[PDB]
Each structure stands twice: as C-alpha cells, then as structure tokens.
Write an enzyme that holds these catalytic residues in place. Structure first.
Site, PDB file in Angstrom:
ATOM      1  N   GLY A 174      26.641  62.606 105.344  1.00  0.00           N
ATOM      2  CA  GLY A 174      25.766  63.668 105.842  1.00  0.00           C
ATOM      3  C   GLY A 174      25.827  64.963 105.041  1.00  0.00           C
ATOM      4  N   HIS A 200      16.442  60.709  97.973  1.00  0.00           N
ATOM      5  CA  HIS A 200      16.846  59.509  98.723  1.00  0.00           C
ATOM      6  C   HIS A 200      16.696  59.665 100.250  1.00  0.00           C
ATOM      7  CE1 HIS A 200      21.205  61.016  98.347  1.00  0.00           C
ATOM      8  NE2 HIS A 200      21.005  61.002  99.668  1.00  0.00           N
ATOM      9  N   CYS A 241      25.027  65.288 101.835  1.00  0.00           N
ATOM     10  CA  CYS A 241      24.024  65.288 100.756  1.00  0.00           C
ATOM     11  C   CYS A 241      23.043  66.429 100.944  1.00  0.00           C
ATOM     12  CB  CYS A 241      23.315  63.942 100.655  1.00  0.00           C
ATOM     13  SG  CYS A 241      24.436  62.553 100.330  1.00  0.00           S
TER      14      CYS A 241
END
Lengths: 303, 303
Positions: free
Chosen positions: B146, B41, B148
C-alpha cells in the site's frame, strides 16, 4: 520489508514554530493557543552566562523585553501581553491564538522511549530526526548554535504528545532538554557550568526488538538453541552497562510471530556484545538500541 | 555536534498526498496544481500483474474509472477531468488546483545522492526517512503493501525537488521507483516478474565525508601520512566495488577545516577496506556511505 530510522510527519508541529528574541539573544519557541513556550536562558546576557540568576533576570524583564515572530506560512508579529517562568522554561502569553494548534498533550518520556525531533533555526524548521531518551537522560541528536527551543514529540492517533524542548549541549553529540512541565531531563542545569552525565547504557528491550526485526527480514544467524533467563540476564546487565530487561505485550507479539523466544535473544545479546565477528545484522556491525518494540511492530507488520 | 539520519521537514509534501483508486486497486498519488501523479499499475488487476498491457489498459479507462480523495487537512473528493500516461506514471487532471502546492521542480537523482521519503498508506502520511540512491539504482527503505506512490524529494531554498515515486519491492529491503519524467530508476519494469539488480558499490565520496565527520569528532586513528592520488584511487575503485571519486567544494571545505587531505582519506579507505584493525569509527567496524559531504557540512559546521 526493511527497517529504517523513521520520524513522524512534521507538518502539524512546523505550524507551531516561532522565533523568540530577548535583548541580543535569539532562539525557537512553540506556539500553542495563546501561549509561546521557550527556554528561559533567552533572558541571559553573554557576560552572565558563567553564573546566571534567573529569578533576578525574570524580575528585570517586562513584556517589551520579548519579541515573537512567525516566519513560516502566513508570517506575523505576535504581541507579548504576559510573561512567566515554569522551571527551566518561559511561558509567554501572546494576543493571538495559533489558528493551527493541533490536538495535543504534554507527556514526559522514560529512558528507552523514542520520539521525533523537529530541528529549527531562527524559528525556521530545517530538519527532522528520531532519538531515544538515553538511560543517562541525554539524547544523541544533531543540534548547532541557535537550535535551542527545537521540540520533541510523538503522535498518538490525531493527538501530538509534546515531550521535549531542546536546551543545551553537554558534550560532542550529547544533548539535553526539558519536559513541558519545566523540569530538565536528568536534572541537568540550564547554565553553562560544569556538569557530568552518568554512564550511558544499552537499552536491552530495544536491542531485543531490533534482533526480532532482523529475524523477520531473513537475518537469523545469531539465533541458537541456547537461552539466558531474564533473571540471569538482568544480573549480567548490571555489570555490563545494559538496562534491566522488562518484557511487554509488543515484545511477546514479536516472539510469537518469529517462533524465537526472548531468552534465546538475551543469550545472543551476551554473545554479540563480545563481537559480531565481522558479520552484519541489518547493515550494522554493533548492537542497535534505538528501535523500540512498537517501532519494529509498525515497520514490519500492520501492528 | 552529533551525526544522525536527517530528513527535510515534510509539511509541504504532506499537503499534496492523495489516495487514487481504480477498480479494486488503491495507492498514493501526488497532487500539484490541477495534476495528480500516481504509478500506472493502479489500472492493473491482480490476475494481469505478471504480464500487463498498459497501452490496452489505458484505452479501456475513462475519467470515471479513477477516484481521487484527499484525507488529511481539509478533506475533499477531486473530480477527474483528464487522464494520460507518461512512462511508468499516470498523469490525472483534476478540476481543483491544490491550494497548498509548494514551489517545485522534477529532478532525477544520481547514485550517492540523498533524499527524503514521505511514506504513505491510503493517502495518509505515516512516516519520513532519508535514503541514498544506490549505485545499482535501488534504495534501502522501509515500505509495506500500500506504500506505492509514496514520494522522495530534496529542498533547495524554498523549492521542493521531487525526485522519486515508489513503485515496487525487488528483494528484502531493496526498493525501486521512478523519476517524475516517468522513467524507472535502473530501467526496472513495473511488472510482477523476476528481475536481477546489478551489484551494489560503496559510494566513495560519501565514505570520505563520513571519515571527515569522524575526524571532527576526535576519531582520527586511521589517518596516516600516506596518500593515494584520486587517479590511482579511481583505478583501484573500478576493481574493488567502489564508485569513482569526484571531488566537490563541500569535500574541500572538510579538508580545510580538519587539515587532513582528500588523498590521505583515499589511502585510509583502501586500508580500512582490508579490515578495521580491531578498532571502531563512529560506532562502526565497517565503512559508512549514506552520509554525503553536504550532510556532514550542514550537521557538523552548519554551512
């Protein structure tokens, strides 16, 4: 979102762990520059653990009595070229400066303050966890035989603040150690002799911080219009094994973000102490006091 | 003695954390040899997060669309020379092999199993904690915007087993991610749509492990001569939101040390589920299931 027991990344400290041997005794040491710090009880033989004389033991030692080994990373044997005693710690001088010494300071922690522990066995790091210095100057960790010399610390910017060196187990799940100035927290002795710890207390400002964390995660069933002033709470605290509440800018930040006043949470603490009534707060059924206001501010917001 | 949430030392994993940028999206990546793994993503713009077409997004990308940076330790910019998609992850090929790649494997964790998480922001490790993979394929962690690309792992000897890469937050304190084969735990989608998670369950073998830890600390009020066979317990478990109990050598070791049989603790679980009789077990009035048998064995006995 979410609140967990979080430790600092342990990499910088792992690079400083070494093994210290003296006779048939083995434990962990901390290698910073040309110095290795370790508990002085490494000099004590089994037959003298019931009543040791450390000043006599130190005199009897030579540089040959100590063996220092690095097991992690590039392994090396370090030559001991000097020895000294500073309170309950030995300060060994080695001939090689640690090439991975982080930027560091020595600091003493106060009750209610949190720090990370790197648990080690035979100079090898095996686990990391976070503890709070208890109001009775003990810590509730997880340490087995051979964990002495494991270190406690925090990280401020790029600087490691070393605050604890593991010394002994007093009772089941109750431990103590020294600050790097050589003083034992709570003035306990580094000897296998009878010593009773004072009664533990709930760290009030940490319970307030944890209740603010619950509100920020959608858990606020315990919040009522009712309030207890900090003066009334502190008088109540004296008779109910709770520390004196002392407010800070970090607690104020949590009060302004949630819109819930500190006094409303002091009332909630007095009620929750008499029972949660089968209800949960952040997956807990009893008051949590090992999350500092700074910890909640970090985990919930950028602060 | 003492039972705490313990993580693996994070040093080996810290040396692999990098930052990955694609357009105005930034997250964390894992650098092993000439490969950087990150959530796919990172290629998705904000306006397309509700309904993304990842196969179309991948085609539109070039090696120059990805910027990889190492911030901690010796900093370096890594040049991307290849890109590929494996399930919900991107596999970037870089021109420099990570000089601190640990010995590693990719393993999928089962519900009830514990692992350590290294939480990162902008390619910088900020904290470490331990979680259990829930029977509904979620984890209860602490992650903010943030995080991820933060990684989960276990250690067997000198081998790091990478088992999790942080992808998304489903609900307050409920998180999910993928295994390094690209498959999302619980088959959740890596997109901004409402998805319902199945009901959670108590991890039976972990509750037994925690009851053994309580007996080893002197807390055994819940132990009665009464027993429930594992076959009877498992039929009961199906209808009461408990996982199927499966015995192991680690549980057997706890039964031998304490002298309390597994079947006595299965009966105790059925009784404690209907109420803690006005008493507590290791500071709790509800069953605890995030301490595994291996965890209890290592922390209480050191095996």
């Amino acid at each position: 979102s979410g609140l967990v027991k979080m430790s600092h990344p342990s990499g910088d400290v792992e690079a400083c762990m070494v093994q210290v041997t003296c006779g048939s005794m083995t434990l962990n040491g901390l290698w910073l520059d040309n110095t290795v710090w370790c508990p002085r009880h490494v000099m004590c033989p089994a037959d003298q653990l019931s009543d040791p004389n450390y000043d006599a033991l130190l005199i009897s030692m030579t540089n040959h009595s100590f063996s220092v080994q690095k097991h992690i990373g590039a392994p090396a044997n370090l030559r001991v070229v000097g020895h000294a005693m500073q309170g309950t710690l030995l300060k060994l001088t080695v001939d090689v400066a640690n090439p991975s010494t982080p930027a560091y300071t020595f600091t003493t922690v106060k009750p209610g303050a949190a720090f990370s522990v790197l648990a080690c066995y035979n100079g090898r790091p095996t686990g990391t966890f976070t503890v709070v210095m208890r109001p009775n100057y003990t810590i509730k960790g997880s340490f087995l035989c051979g964990s002495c010399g494991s270190v406690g610390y925090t990280k401020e910017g790029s600087v490691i603040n070393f605050c604890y060196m593991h010394q002994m187990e007093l009772a089941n799940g109750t431990h103590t150690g020294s600050a790097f100035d050589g003083t034992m927290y709570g003035a306990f002795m580094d000897k296998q002799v009878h010593q009773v710890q004072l009664t533990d207390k709930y760290c009030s400002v940490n319970v307030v911080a944890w209740l603010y964390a619950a509100i920020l995660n959608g858990c606020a069933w315990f919040v009522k219009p009712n309030r207890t002033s900090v003066v009334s709470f502190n008088e109540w605290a004296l008779a109910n094994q709770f520390t004196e509440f002392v407010g800070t800018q970090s607690v104020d930040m949590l009060a302004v973000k949630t819109g819930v006043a500190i006094e409303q949470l002091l009332y909630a603490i007095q009620q929750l102490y008499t029972g949660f009534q089968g209800k949960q707060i952040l997956g807990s059924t009893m008051l949590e006091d090992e999350f500092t206001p700074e910890d909640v501010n970090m985990q919930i917001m950028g602060v």
